[PDB]
Amino acid sequence: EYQNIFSQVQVRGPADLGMTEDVNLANRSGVGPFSTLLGWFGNAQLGPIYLGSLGVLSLFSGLMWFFTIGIWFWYQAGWNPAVFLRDLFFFSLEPPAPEYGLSFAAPLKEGGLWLIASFFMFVAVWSWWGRTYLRAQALGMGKHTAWAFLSAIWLWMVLGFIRPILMGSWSEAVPYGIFSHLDWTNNFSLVHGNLFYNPFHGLSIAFLXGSALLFAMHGATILAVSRFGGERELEQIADRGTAAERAALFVRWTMGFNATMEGIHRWAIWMAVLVTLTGGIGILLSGTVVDNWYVWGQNHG
Amino acid sequence: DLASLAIYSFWIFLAGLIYYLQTENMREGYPLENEDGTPAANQGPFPLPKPKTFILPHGRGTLTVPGPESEDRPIALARTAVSEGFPHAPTGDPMKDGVGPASWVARRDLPELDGHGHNKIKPMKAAAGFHVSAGKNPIGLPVRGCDLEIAGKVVDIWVDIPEQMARFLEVELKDGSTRLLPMQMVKVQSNRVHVNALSSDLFAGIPTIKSPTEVTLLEEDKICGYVAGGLMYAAPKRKS
Amino acid sequence: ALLSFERKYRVPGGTLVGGNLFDFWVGPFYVGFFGVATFFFAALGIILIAWSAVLQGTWNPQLISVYPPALEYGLGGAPLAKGGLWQIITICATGAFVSWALREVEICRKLGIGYHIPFAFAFAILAYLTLVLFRPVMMGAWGYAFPYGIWTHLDWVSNTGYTYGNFHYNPAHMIAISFFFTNALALALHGALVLSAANPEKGKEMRTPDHEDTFFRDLVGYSIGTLGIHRLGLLLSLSAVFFSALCMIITGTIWFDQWVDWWQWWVKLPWWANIPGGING
Ligand code: BCL
Ligand code: BCL
Ligand code: BCL
Ligand SMILES: CC[C@H]1c2cc3[nH]c4c(c3C)C(=O)[C@H](C(=O)OC)c4c3nc(cc4[nH]c(cc(n2)[C@@H]1C)c(C(C)=O)c4C)[C@@H](C)[C@@H]3CCC(=O)OC/C=C(\C)CCC[C@H](C)CCC[C@H](C)CCCC(C)C
Ligand SMILES: COC(C)(C)C/C=C/C(C)=C/C=C/C(C)=C/C=C/C(C)=C/C=C\C=C(C)\C=C\C=C(/C)CC/C=C(\C)CCC=C(C)C
Ligand SMILES: CCCCCCCCCCCC[N+](C)(C)[O-]
Ligand SMILES: CCCCCCCCCCCC[N+](C)(C)[O-]
Ligand SMILES: CCCCCCCCCCCC[N+](C)(C)[O-]
Ligand SMILES: [Cl-]
Ligand SMILES: [Fe+3]
């Protein structure tokens, strides 16, 4: 044995143009190169990428968001490259002061540039969500990916859009910066009296560390029974082999309760989406309904 | 208050979620049985799920689970005690009878096909345009059993065409026949290929596939079961 | 209490020690020697937790807590009433965790599968000992470890992190964070990517791994595959815990001041530190 992590030998054939089904063609670019570097881990083929209407709209809106922030970083950096790199972590795009509040009459140098970048981010992410749904339906596939992404959109909409509207201003929200969105996260817990008492914060970790436990254990399983070809996880669903029989038993013999091949993925998708599902609820209620989770813990209501 | 409602109504949603999940992991393997094969008394505290039906692609029928479970192969073991939960010793050669770590499953004696209909695993030289991209090229090297004796030489690489990766080592033994070696079971070395699981006299016992251009699901399991099972039941020889 | 297919694999042999003595099951559970040890450390450990609750004077689980010795005790013994019980419970907990992992290896030999599960577990055991043994030994006191309480091991996480300013600035906290966030992202897709193929549109045939790889390449222009995503899984997870052990063993030992001030080496580099204009320097 060799603990099947990397690959000893690399094989390669003609470029894989993928399946068709109802996927509009043409759009797939010419296949990219083959990177041997990645082939030791996973596949070596890059592309072909599909770029549609929402695809271009998304990539365009995202680069607009990327640049609108970076332009501001140069203004602070006196247009000097040396101080750009030095203070790079410290520049920040803060939202309008509370004196404004929802109103879009904030000057550029005092919050107006936030809403510009926020509008690009808002449309680029949802353009990508629409993209993750149309690629699922185009291949006549389940749409499980589009709903899991909605869970991550949930926390993101709560942080920057759902909660600022409920609070009554954008003075809240999140500023675009490296070291500054770290200080924001610190402050949020401080102002609300240790998010640790927030029961949904505590439930978010339990699922954040699910995800660490589950995917550490599941990846180790398939590698442990790769020797029976357990990586081919769909044909084992449609026709159980020993790779799945040994998989169910080791889980049974070690902790009692059992798991199947399709079953363990049902565990997997929820243990992940529950992180941001409970997270968005605990951040949305924070400040809107509960002012201080500590005191809430003292009364339970 | 409102937050107490959200934290309570969610602690209920989770309780129904754990229910739903734990019943979906009952499709295969249930109903539980005693060691003698008859259905057990208590079968867990969770009911069985409403039967779901898969539409197998390429028109290979439909698997519906949870379905009637039968081994479809004779298991050659015997009790070692009079109480439950004790091991069962085999009554023959576990690697030929296929028990313990050398167990296989009676999957369809058909090959897995790609989304286009053709065989997923073809020998390289049947595979148009395929070759070795990087790393050592095991074709040509002598596969040696781990008892430091040599039992054959690699005369091909059985590759996976959709996922482009080597899956088997077509190993030809001294009598001219060829076996298949699970690739996660050999160590491709600079001047040899080294197989931890087996010794020399055991390569000829590896199950033989029928059509020399394709290996089927049932055939794959008797091979990978054999080789993988040889770790425990081999031990006849080999050290370093 | 056997699965429909379990009889073939329940053969004897493969024990790491003891031979066929503890080679048997209890219901669905495999015993083995280390199942006996695991039960022994766990059972004997629970006894001490209820005893510690007796001496402290409460049985509600939200108030029971077993703090380690005081700082004045160093790395010496302590009376059971004042930290000494935590000293023993930690041994029992360590015994239960190594016996659990070693019993898993015995299960692996029986099924002839790889040892990837117990070796992945080992990274969590190393993170545990980093907090309760490796870091407090380097520091010269047991009172630097965390106490065994439900809501009182969060208080230790808050006081320890805020001792060094905003603990969000630890270079290895940051790195450990990223692997954790990505692993959940990585697990979120792989779970959805498999089910979206085995459960296609309503009435459509089951899709293939071909359909899987085509989905990713259409979405982002690359697919790591099926054997690669599982490696990415095992790696993103053990890497997350790894730095979560690293980020802690350096905290207070080789560096004990505000972690925000560690980042002054970058800002105070000779070729731009003395270049004003930039309002952050
Ligand atoms: C890793 C960084 C910190 C830490 C910071 C936090 C923070 C911050 C939080 C927790 C939370 C939890 N922590 Mg802590 N905690 C640490 C170390 C530990 C250790 C340990 C090393 O032995 C344990 C057992 C726990 C235990 C727990 C649980 C009470 C809870 C949810 C865990 C979970 O579901 O994980 C995922 C694992 C699974 C889903 C698998 C099943 C695990 C079951 C549920 C664990 C039950 C533990 C039980 C109470 C211990 C009983 C001991 C008896 C002797 C048998 N912590 C270290 C010191 N921990 C959360 C909480 O809600 O606290 C109130 C939370 O938000
Ligand atoms: C001192 C600071 C406070 C604190 C304050 C907060 C605050 C404030 C928040 C959290 C949040 C989280 N905290 Mg806390 N928390 C603390 C202590 C902890 C500790 C600990 C000490 O052990 C842990 C482990 C956690 C754990 C966690 C997570 C469970 C949770 C975030 C889930 C997640 O991944 O969101 C990350 C996921 C997202 C942000 C979703 C993003 C989706 C979008 C669409 C992505 C867009 C990408 C963009 C387009 C870029 C493209 C790039 C290129 C294409 C490559 N907290 C202390 C007490 N914590 C969050 C939470 O759940 O609160 C309830 C939160 O808001
Ligand atoms: C106010 C608090 C401070 C802070 C201070 C700390 C402290 C203090 C710690 C961390 C650590 C961590 N923090 Mg921090 N951190 C903060 C902000 C954050 C934020 C955020 C949103 O800003 C996030 C997401 C995080 C995230 C994290 C992770 C990187 C890391 C936790 C994982 C880990 O160590 O697992 C490690 C895994 C384990 C310990 C698991 C061990 C399990 C054992 C082996 C088995 C138990 C079995 C049990 C008995 C079973 C019982 C039940 C059964 C049924 C029998 N921090 C703020 C600024 N951070 C921790 C760390 O780095 O640890 C190295 C840590 O100690
Ligand atoms: C390294 C990557 C991640 C990982 C992986 C991982 N964990 C694993 C495995 C793997 C691969 C297993 O195979 C193993 C298992 O059996 O899973 C089903 C396990 C496991 N991970 C567990 C938990 C766990 N893992 C965690 C984390 C992680 N697990 C990492 C993030 C956490 C977190 C985040 O805190 C927890 C709580 C268990 C469910 C299980 C190991 C069970 C075990 O050791 O059982 C033997 C012990 C007992 C039966 C009880 C002993 C009681 C003591 C004698 C008393 C002392 C009490 C306690 C130590 C202190 C106080 C608790 C308070 C702080 C609340
Ligand atoms: C030299 O290189 C150049 C300058 C060319 C390019 C480089 C650019 C640089 C340096 C870019 C750096 C970017 C950084 C540091 C980005 C960091 C972003 C982070 C950390 C963001 C964190 C969180 C963001 C959140 C929570 C966002 C929330 C908001 C939304 C998702 C959108 C919601 C917005 C609303 C509701 C307001 C707008 C609404 C409408 C209807 C228009
Ligand atoms: C977030 C998605 C960004 C696009 C990444 C695309 C990666 C591979 C692109 C394939 C290259 C094909 N091309 C255009 C060079 O011929
Ligand atoms: C995120 C994917 C990580 C890229 C994988 C890096 C591969 C480098 C190691 C290849 C090892 C090959 N070798 C020589 C040991 O056989
Ligand atoms: C998907 C279920 C498996 C994980 C559930 C166990 C974690 C529960 C954590 C309870 C948290 C307690 N509290 C009060 C903070 O909510
Ligand atoms: Cl590592
Ligand atoms: Fe999987």
Side-chain angles (χ1 to χ4, degrees), chain A residues 24-40:
Chain A
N24 171 6
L25 271 287
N27 287 322
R28 306 233 197 89
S29 74
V31 303
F34 287 47
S35 155
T36 280
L37 181 43
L38 311 164
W40 304 113

Side-chain angles (χ1 to χ4, degrees), chain A residues 196 201-203 205-207 209-210 213 271, chain C residues 46 49 97 128 131 146 150-151 153-154 156-157:
Chain A
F196 271 149
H201 193 275
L203 275 188
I205 300 196
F207 299 137
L213 157 61
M271 185 76 38
Chain C
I46 302 277
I49 302 184
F97 295 2
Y128 174 85
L131 307 189
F146 67 88
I150 286 191
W151 289 100
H153 85 302
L154 276 43
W156 173 97
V157 168

Side-chain angles (χ1 to χ4, degrees), chain A residues 84-97:
Chain A
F84 191 75
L85 279 307
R86 161 185 95 200
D87 299 354
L88 183 38
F89 305 121
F90 307 67
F91 317 89
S92 190
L93 207 77
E94 309 266 339

Side-chain angles (χ1 to χ4, degrees), chain B residues 105-151:
Chain B
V105 185
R107 332 180 61 208
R108 280 160 327 177
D109 187 2
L110 289 206
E112 199 195 321
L113 322 173
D114 58 37
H116 277 136
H118 320 303
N119 298 7
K120 193 142 166 3
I121 299 193
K122 267 164 167 176
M124 242 209 329
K125 337 237 220 126
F130 277 62
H131 58 309
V132 166
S133 285
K136 204 43 191 193
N137 184 323
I139 317 185
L141 292 103
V143 164
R144 91 171 145 138
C146 274
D147 63 353
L148 306 208
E149 264 313 320
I150 308 194

Side-chain angles (χ1 to χ4, degrees), chain A residues 258-279:
Chain A
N258 52 276
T260 73
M261 203 71 154
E262 182 195 26
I264 195 94
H265 296 277
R266 300 234 139 224
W267 268 116
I269 172 150
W270 282 106
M271 185 76 38
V273 305
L274 287 178
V275 182
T276 78
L277 207 76
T278 73

Side-chain angles (χ1 to χ4, degrees), chain B residues 5-80:
Chain B
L5 202 74
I7 198 54
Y8 192 39
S9 46
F10 175 88
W11 260 122
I12 284 190
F13 159 87
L14 211 63
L17 189 49
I18 305 286
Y19 185 58
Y20 156 80
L21 301 174
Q22 196 76 33
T23 52
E24 288 278 306
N25 297 281
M26 303 201 149
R27 307 259 179 205
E28 320 220 50
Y30 281 46
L32 296 194
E33 43 196 42
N34 313 89
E35 308 207 294
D36 78 344
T38 44
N42 170 49
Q43 285 236 317
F46 282 126
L48 277 143
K50 319 316 232 207
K52 96 186 313 182
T53 292
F54 283 111
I55 294 117
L56 281 152
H58 304 355
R60 337 196 76 184
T62 65
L63 163 87
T64 188
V65 284
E69 306 263 326
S70 55
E71 283 321 277
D72 287 7
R73 35 151 302 161
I75 281 81
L77 297 152
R79 295 209 110 178
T80 52

